[PDB]
């Protein structure tokens, strides 16, 4: 579910991404935290793929 969420953040449909994590994890606070953590991981991957 994390890989499909990272892929939705890669395509950047963030609202359906957030609804996906909150349906498959639970509380909306936890969903905001996991979306922000996956965006940080995906940003680290973008920096590593840059250089």
């Amino acid at each position: 579910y994390e890989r499909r969420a990272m892929e939705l953040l890669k395509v950047s449909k963030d609202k359906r991404a957030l609804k996906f994590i909150k349906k498959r994890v639970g509380t909306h606070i936890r969903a905001k935290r996991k979306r922000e953590e996956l965006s940080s991981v995906l940003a680290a991957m973008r920096k590593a793929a840059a250089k």
Partner: protein, 206 residues
Amino acid sequence: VSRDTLYEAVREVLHGNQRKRRKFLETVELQISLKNYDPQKDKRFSGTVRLKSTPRPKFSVCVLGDQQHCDEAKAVDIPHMDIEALKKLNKNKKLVKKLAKKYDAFLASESLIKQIPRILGPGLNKAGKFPSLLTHNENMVAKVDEVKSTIKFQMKKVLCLAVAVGHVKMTDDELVYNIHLAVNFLVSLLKKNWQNVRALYIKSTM
């Protein structure tokens, strides 16, 4: 945003002085891309950045002033253009737009923005060219320096922004402090916070 990555970006531009060995006066800029902010919808943002380095420094000024400005503006070598000069400026809308092509930004006294909207308020608001007001502190000393580098984040219909901060010869922690203030002011100015951006790009001019 992390700050050691901004340290990485500023080390790569100071040693990407290698990358060009630039041949003009040298400056850089930062660029902003944003995710799903629909430009034709509401909440359109246009805010000025209060910044404490003047990253332009070759900044082109002429002022529009009343008296008390004559001797001090000619002592500090700044064009004081009074109302009869403004009459000569107002008799043609062709040359007055080409001196704004010469001169980068303006600033005007307290009562002369009652005489600029005669016909020429709508005449030369056709550049995005606000003349900024002075005060009754009556000092353009350091106020020209702090009204320059009040940088306009503007929402127009293209979904990209590019703001000139950084010449590569200032000191590095103060320039990343400039980028710090600018980006958190933009994140505050937006409809929503730091999630609203795509990617911030601080690559050089050339």
